[PDB]
Each structure stands twice: as structure tokens, then as C-alpha cells.
Enzyme design. Sequence first.
Site, mmCIF file in Angstrom:
data_model
loop_
_atom_site.group_PDB
_atom_site.id
_atom_site.type_symbol
_atom_site.label_atom_id
_atom_site.label_comp_id
_atom_site.label_asym_id
_atom_site.label_seq_id
_atom_site.Cartn_x
_atom_site.Cartn_y
_atom_site.Cartn_z
ATOM 1 N N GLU A 191 0.825 -1.207 0.000
ATOM 2 C CA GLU A 191 0.000 0.000 0.000
ATOM 3 C C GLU A 191 0.862 1.262 0.000
ATOM 4 O O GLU A 191 0.571 2.214 -0.727
ATOM 5 C CB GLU A 191 -0.964 0.026 1.203
ATOM 6 N N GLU A 217 -4.917 4.646 -0.343
ATOM 7 C CA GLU A 217 -3.759 3.822 0.012
ATOM 8 C C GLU A 217 -3.358 4.016 1.477
ATOM 9 O O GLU A 217 -2.948 3.061 2.138
ATOM 10 C CB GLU A 217 -2.564 4.093 -0.905
ATOM 11 N N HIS A 240 -5.736 1.971 3.421
ATOM 12 C CA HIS A 240 -5.345 0.552 3.340
ATOM 13 C C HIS A 240 -4.161 0.258 4.264
ATOM 14 O O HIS A 240 -4.151 -0.754 4.958
ATOM 15 C CB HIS A 240 -5.039 0.165 1.897
ATOM 16 N N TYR A 248 -4.222 -1.817 11.897
ATOM 17 C CA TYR A 248 -5.388 -2.102 12.727
ATOM 18 C C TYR A 248 -5.580 -3.611 12.924
ATOM 19 O O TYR A 248 -5.887 -4.062 14.041
ATOM 20 C CB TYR A 248 -6.628 -1.465 12.107
ATOM 21 N N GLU A 291 -1.481 -3.354 -8.600
ATOM 22 C CA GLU A 291 -2.869 -3.228 -8.190
ATOM 23 C C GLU A 291 -3.780 -4.202 -8.919
ATOM 24 O O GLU A 291 -4.750 -4.679 -8.336
ATOM 25 C CB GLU A 291 -3.351 -1.784 -8.347
ATOM 26 N N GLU A 334 -9.776 -0.741 -4.986
ATOM 27 C CA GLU A 334 -8.788 -1.181 -5.985
ATOM 28 C C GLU A 334 -9.401 -1.381 -7.367
ATOM 29 O O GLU A 334 -8.719 -1.248 -8.384
ATOM 30 C CB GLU A 334 -8.019 -2.430 -5.525
ATOM 31 N N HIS A 383 -9.169 2.086 -8.676
ATOM 32 C CA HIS A 383 -7.743 2.358 -8.934
ATOM 33 C C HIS A 383 -7.332 1.776 -10.288
ATOM 34 O O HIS A 383 -6.739 2.455 -11.125
ATOM 35 C CB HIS A 383 -6.855 1.775 -7.817
HETATM 36 FE FE LIG Z 1 -4.536 0.884 -5.005
HETATM 37 MN MN LIG Z 2 -4.436 -0.178 -1.964
#
Ligand SMILES: [Fe+3]
Ligand SMILES: [Mn+2]
Lengths: 333, 329
Positions: B98, B129, B132, B138, B202, B236, B239
Amino acid sequence: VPRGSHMQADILDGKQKRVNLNSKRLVNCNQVDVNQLVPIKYKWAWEHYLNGCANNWLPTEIPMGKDIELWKSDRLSEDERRVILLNLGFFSTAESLVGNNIVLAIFKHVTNPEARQYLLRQAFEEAVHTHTFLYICESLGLDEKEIFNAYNERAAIKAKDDFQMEITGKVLDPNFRTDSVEGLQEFVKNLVGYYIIMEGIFFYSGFVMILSFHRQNKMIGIGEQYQYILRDETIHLNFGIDLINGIKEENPEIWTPELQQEIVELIKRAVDLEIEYAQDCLPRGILGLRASMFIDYVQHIADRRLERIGLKPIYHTKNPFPWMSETIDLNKE
Amino acid sequence: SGLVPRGSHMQADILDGKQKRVNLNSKRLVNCNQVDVNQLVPIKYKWAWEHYLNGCANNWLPTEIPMGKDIELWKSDRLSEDERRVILLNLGFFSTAESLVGNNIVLAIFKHVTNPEARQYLLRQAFEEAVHTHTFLYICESLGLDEKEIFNAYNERAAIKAKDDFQMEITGKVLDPNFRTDSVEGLQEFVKNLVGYYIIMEGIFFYSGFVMILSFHRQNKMIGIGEQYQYILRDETIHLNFGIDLINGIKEENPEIWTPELQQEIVELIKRAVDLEIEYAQDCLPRGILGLRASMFIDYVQHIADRRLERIGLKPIYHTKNPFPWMSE
Ligand SMILES: [Fe+3]
Ligand SMILES: [Mn+2]
Ligand SMILES: [Fe+3]
Ligand SMILES: [Mn+2]
């Protein structure tokens, strides 16, 4: 925890690349892996990031029906329209100036992943702010090219952004580096220019003008958008101050009497330019707003910014807009 | 649609400044220095603006997704060693991937995409990103994983390192301070970077991972992680669509760059990515788990590679079937 709850290395040499927290630095950090977020050192930067993430909003969520009705009517004076139009003109491109600077100038040299996380949130927030001005133009039926090109057509706006270009320094130059005293000082001047001056002084003055309309129940759709923008910019400023102070602490050699005096002179120049801008916005003044109030206000906030970065207040004026701090208290991080 | 009222125009006091208003037809995706890039308007690339609006509509945070059942399952003997291996390798790879993608948007792509509406999208993508990246921190904190062990995986695990090293290679010279896109050679190099990040990283390297993790989710295992990956997949998807539109847009505006030579090079880059991703899948799955075997990823990775190829105007080369059609539901 049960068997098999750990990643097993098959490159044993690679465990050395795990990051020592105390090796991390805000600038000039090439000794550790900048791509790994952990372990987080600058908890302040991470907290700003988490706080920003909790503030999601979109301009399109705010109804413009009443604003459109007011704008299209004959109820606003030409002088009132002038304040609105000049503010829209300045903000429409200033958001992009700030966002582009984060990406093209600041990000490369802030050699730290948690600070960079914040920068990505901030830059996205500047995109939201740019969307806001497009949305306002489309909603009210303004000539969008006239508004967005204002910084090329109105002298008092151009003056501010020409100054901004000057204080940007050579940070964009392919040859620019921060691993000299002079280089890091130039970088810090850029941070002061954008966080302290553009975001912390130019924008706050615009906030008063627009939110003065909101308080009169005029253009409350624009007003509400500006309230969200103020809430974001509060964090932008807080982060910038923290970053400047962090760089200072880690690199005390940059904080010479010479750099200190130059920062003071830049802030003074900003104050003068914002006052001239306020005068262009308010040649006669409108209900609740006169240029003289901005003389005191801009000086007042400049003193507050100076204090936060360890410099003495220089103007000693009082705040003629106590309500700004009321909405500022409500929009406090 | 009401009348423009008297006094509602901003008056210029710099008379020739009007010349800097942007002509829509002068805007271009790259090498656009004839008009002011700072002004958003007028928007030319509607597709870029649409991606931006779509992304903005997709706001989520990993902290919104409860990890209680995941923690309970992770503590239990109900998840096998082999299942844990799949999860941990994926967390290891994604945790830094990421940042690689986000850093590349900012440090490599943004400067050279000389268009404000496309740049608006890039800022949304880079922020996603960051979300992500937060997700993997987390997950680590929720499950009590050794965060340094997870985030350093791309330095500690050969199959992960191989993918990321190949990624560094296809990044090309774009980070060179003096890299420019204003030559055929420069623009081809830039397009290879876009293929490397949007198409390969990606669009391919994330996909064995999505399948593996979402396979758990479908079996009601680690549904907290699964849900986070569903949100990541949603992002994504955009993206990838933006990247394809960008690559295709640059090609359309600069058709001379899309030589038989470049086309062949891109196919060869994608073939190599396929091999590396299949090897990664093998590392994740030395033995089968429910509905997942390393050999299935030969077919799947080749199938998605064909789909990516088609989207940027290149012939499919593998002709394999998709063993995971539920990924399209
Ligand atoms: Fe991405
Ligand atoms: Mn990502
Ligand atoms: Fe800001
Ligand atoms: Mn802003």
C-alpha cells in the site's frame, strides 16, 4: 496464541531492516526503511491523521437551494457580491496551490511514514476544498473560468499568490536538497509559507468574510461548506506547526537569529498583503464588515501563529471577531 | 437557470490576465505546459472526474469494522497452521505494498500527470492507500501480531521480496529528479511505470491475495479481515479502472509511443509478473486449504492477466478459465 501465528523468515539477513523507532527522523532520514509505517514515532502526526479521517464530508452533501435563490435575486448589494466573488476567486486556486505543494514539494522531504500518512489525508482534503469551489460556481451559475482565473486578473489576489510563489523557494527544483543547513532552512520557509501564511493567515481572513454572511443568514450553503473547511484547516495548521517545531527540535542549528528574523519578515509581508486584499474586498464596507476590523484581526492571528512556532508576538492587537474563536472552539481538533 | 444579475461578475483590474483562462481543447494528460495546471476548470477528462466522485462516495475506515469474532477465532484452535500462514503472508505483503503504491502516486505519477481533474483523482487514490495502510496496522493491533514482523515481511520472505523487487525495477527512472516525459523515450518509461503499478501491482499482485482472504470470508472465517478486504477490493477496482483509462488516454493523445516494441515489452513485463505471482501463491499454499490450491492460481493469475491485457489493447495470451467466478459477484 496457537501454533503458527508468526510469519517465518526465509531471508535471515532481512530481519535487520526492521525499523528502530529511535532512528526515525522527520527530515533527512535515509538510514531506515521509510516504506514501513511501524513502529510509529511521531504519535502527534498519527493522531492528526486519525482526527482528519473522522471529519469526512463532501460539498455535494450541502444543499445550495437557498443560496441560489438569494444569489439570483436582487437582494444582495453589489458590494456584498464583491466580497463573495473575490473570496471565491482567491480560494478556487489557492486550495490547489496548497495541495500541489504538499505533493510536489513537502512529501519528498518529510522522510517519515506517519507524517506522510497525514500529508495524504491533508492533500485529499485540499481536493475536497477545490471541489467545493467548483460546486459553488456551478450551483450559482458563475462563470467558472472567470472565478478560477481570478488570481491572474485581480491585482490584490495576484499579489498574494506571487508572494506565495516567492516563499515556495526552490523546493521544486530537481537539484533541491534538505541535507544542508541552508537547504533545510529553505524547506522550513516553505512550510511556514504554506501552513502558517497561506493556511494560517490568508485562509482564516477569508473565513471571517464568508462566515460573516453565514451569521447573517446569507449564503448559508457556502457558509456551511466553509465551516467544514475551517474544521479541516484547523488540523492542517496544527500539523504544520507540529512539523515545523519537530524539524527545529531535531535540527537546532537551522533556528538561527537570521532564520528567525526572516520568518518574522515573511509573516509581516503576509499581514500587509492580506490587509491590502481585505481593502480590495471592502472598499466601502458592508453590514458587519469593515477593512479596519481586518487590520486588527490579521495582526491578531499573525501574533498567535508567531507564538506557536516560538517567536514573539509583534502587533499586540485584540481580536475584533470573538465569534470566530467560538466557531473555532466548536471546530477545535 | 435564472438570469445573471447585474453586479455578479468579478471585475478584472489586470486587463490582459483574461488570456490565462484555460481553453478546454488545450488540456492534455501529459506534457501540458501551455495552460495553467492549477485551475481545475474547465474539466476535460470527465472519466477522471467521475472516478474521483466515485472514490469520494466510498468512504470507510478499518476502525468501523468489528474485530471481536476474528480475535476469538485467531485465539482458538479452529484456525489451522496452514490457514494462519495464508493470512500472515498476505498481511505481510499488503502491509507495505500500500505504501509502495501510495508513494509512487505522489513521488512518480502526480508530477507528470499535468491535468488537474486527473490529479484530483490521484489525491483520492493516495489517501485510499493510506486507509489501506491503516487497515493493516489495525489488523496487527487487533490480533496482537508482531507489527514489525508483519511490516518487514517484504524484506524477510523471498516470494514477497521477489514481487516487490520486480516492482522497484519497473518503477524505472521515474524518481530521478531530472526524469521528464517530454520525449518518446521518457513517455514510454512513464507508461511502463503506470503499467507496473496500476496493471501489475494493483491489477494482478493483489488478486491471489484477494481470492485467498475472501475465501476465508466466504467460509465465515476472519470475517473482520474479510470485510476490510472487501472495502479494499472496492477501492482497488476504481484504482485499476482509472489507471487503464489513464494509460489508454496517454496512448490516444500520443499514439507514436505505442510501438510494437513497447507493446511486446509490456506483455513481457506482465508475463514475468504472472510467474512471480504464481510463485507467491505457491509460497502461501504449500498444501491445500478448503477450496484453495496453488495450482488453481496458475489458471486464475493467467486469466486475470489476459483481462488486463485486453483492457489496454493487447491480445490475451493464456486463454485459461477462471477458477474463482464468485470474485465477479
Ligand atoms: Fe490501489
Ligand atoms: Mn491499496
Ligand atoms: Fe489546508
Ligand atoms: Mn484547504
